[model samples]
Target chain A: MQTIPHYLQIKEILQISKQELLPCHVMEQHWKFYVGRSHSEALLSW
Target chain B: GLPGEVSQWSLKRYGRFMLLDNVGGSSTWKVFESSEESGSLVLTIVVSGHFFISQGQTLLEGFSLIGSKNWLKIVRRMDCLLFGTTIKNKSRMFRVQFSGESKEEALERCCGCVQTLAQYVTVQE
Candidate 1:
């Protein structure tokens, strides 16, 4: 999992609580999103 | 009893020989076989279930972290068994294939791999 320091800062600026932040779940969803994008790119290249 | 009622017809007509003649009808029937295998030290595993049905088969799968000197030894042994060389080089990926005729056979094969690896490591430890 890549570090999301920028997103963390955004959440902090917005004063989001841990429960409201949903760090792991949101990160996992984002990670999967990027992974899917990369997979599409690879398939297209293939 | 209905006049046309018939008890469950045995498969004797199929030319199947009864292996044993015990209390359980033909007593020759045995339960289906299923098997699974996995690394105890490493979380990764391969498992099999039931007979290979016409449609497909069920599978168990996972992976684990490497811990303990004993585990390290087994890992090294696996390297030798697979590549015929020591696992000095670091690799991100490891490949394992597991298969079995029955559950017992699969489990036995998996455990056997672990045990054999352990034996090699045990000598070093």
Candidate 2:
């Protein structure tokens, strides 16, 4: 069934210690705040 | 438990991989991998399971000074692997500096050092 997507929030990603936001995290804030920011930016390809 | 150097000795541990400075016998940082060529490894030092960390010591070929954490991060073009949290005191920077501009040699004799410092750290769950 096709449906219009609704806004949402994130999980397990707050504070993230103390660092500036990355270029990619500025997109959809809901998914940007804590949904894997630390692990992604720190570990993933830079 | 991505394999790499820790405390020299050509040894391995299941936990607590320390970067103990031999100077005054101090602990700097704990690393999961000092190299990137070793693939995206995990850090057991931080993350743990239902297991007790091991305590060990010795010196394999060790890094010159500021070097990789996992040892594997010390790939072909890597000169040094460095990371830290100078929070209260204030700072966080992990650097692997080498020639990338005109980028001289793969490194200043790194492979020889990397291989010499290689070891295993089998992290368990």
Per-residue CA lDDT of model 1 for B44-124, tens digit only, reads: 111211111100121111112123232222221211111111123321111132335664554455455545334333312
Off by over 4 Å in 1: A1-46, B1-89, B122-125
Q: Estimate, for each residue in B39-97, the C-alpha lDDT of model 2 and write its tens digit.
A: 22211111111101111211111112223233212212233332222223333323222
Question: Model 1 residue B52 lDDT?
Answer: 11
The segments of candidate 2 whose C-alpha lies over 4 angstroms from its true place after superposition are A1-46, B1-92, B96-108, B120-125
- In Å, residue B107's CA in model 1 sits off its true spot by 1.0
Best of the candidates, DockQ: 2
User: What tier of docking accuracy does candidate 2 attain?
Assistant: incorrect
CA lDDT of each prediction against the hidden true structure = 0.23, 0.24
The digit string of per-residue lDDT tens for model 1 on A1-46 reads 1222121121211111222222333333432432333443311110
lDDT of 2 by residue, A1-46 (tens): 0111111111111122233212222212322221333433322222
